């Protein structure tokens, strides 16, 4: 309500060589057929080349990089032992896909599913 314009700058990749290098240097979030930051599939190289050079992708990456500096409260405060040896499963006693997190012991998972940590993520997925 106090402006009518803004500045301009560019630091994005340019050409197939830059996009392939950017994918390799960020293999944990970017790939030859999917971008996790923008949670979108890239069914062909022409879509991959357009997506990684898009102004929308660059803004999404800038926001994601700023968010990727901390996290909210979680009941997983301390640990020492557990009633089961599960360490690579997908059960509710070890992980939560709504929040995309894992827990050391079933009691921590039970505490998470009834605490504010889960509810904060309900609103995140909902909106
Ligand atoms: Zn993207
Ligand atoms: Zn959860």
DSSP state of 106: H
Q: Which tokens sit at 115?
A: 């605490």
Beta strands in 47-127 (DSSP E): 95-96, 101-102
How was it solved? NMR
In the chain, which segments carry CATH 3.30.160.60? Answer: 15-71, 72-127
Beta strands in the chain (DSSP E): 34-35, 40-41, 95-96, 101-102
Distance CA 37, CA 117 (A): 22
- The closest ligand to the CA of 95 turns out to be 2
Q: Are 106 and 84 in contact (CB under 8 A)?
A: yes
- The closest ligand to the CA of 57 turns out to be 1
DSSP state of 92: T
Q: Which tokens sit at 36?
A: 């996790």
For the domain made up of 72-127, give the CATH fold: Double Stranded RNA Binding Domain (3.30.160)
C-alpha closest to that of 74 among 119, 42, 112, 100: 112
Distance CA 127, CA 43 (A): 27
C-alpha closest to that of 98 among 111, 117, 79: 117
- The closest ligand to the CA of 59 turns out to be 1
For the domain made up of 15-71, give the CATH fold: Double Stranded RNA Binding Domain (3.30.160)
Find out whether 28 is annotated in a ligand binding site: no
Phi, psi of 14 (to 5 degrees): -135, 110
Rounded to the nearest 10 degrees, how much is the dihedral formed by the CA atoms of 36, 37, 40, 41?
A: -40
Those residues whose beta carbon sits under 5 angstroms from the ion ligand 2 are: 96, 98-99, 118
Please give the distance, rounded to the nearest whole angstrom, from the Cα atom of residue 42 to the centre of ligand 1. 10
Find out whether 95 is annotated in a ligand binding site: no
């Amino acid at each position: 309500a106090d402006e009518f314009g803004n500045g301009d700058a560019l630091d994005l990749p340019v050409g197939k060589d830059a996009v392939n290098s950017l994918i390799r240097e960020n293999s944990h979030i970017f790939s030859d057929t999917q971008c996790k930051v923008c949670s979108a599939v890239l069914i062909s190289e022409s879509q991959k080349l357009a997506h990684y050079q898009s102004r929308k992708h660059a803004n999404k990456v800038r926001r994601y990089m700023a968010i990727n500096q901390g996290e909210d409260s979680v009941p997983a405060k301390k640990f020492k032992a557990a009633p089961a040896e599960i360490s690579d499963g997908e059960d509710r006693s070890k992980c939560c896909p709504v929040c995309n997190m894992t827990f050391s012991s079933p009691v921590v998972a039970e505490s998470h599913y009834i605490g504010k940590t889960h509810i904060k993520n309900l609103r995140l997925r909902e909106q």
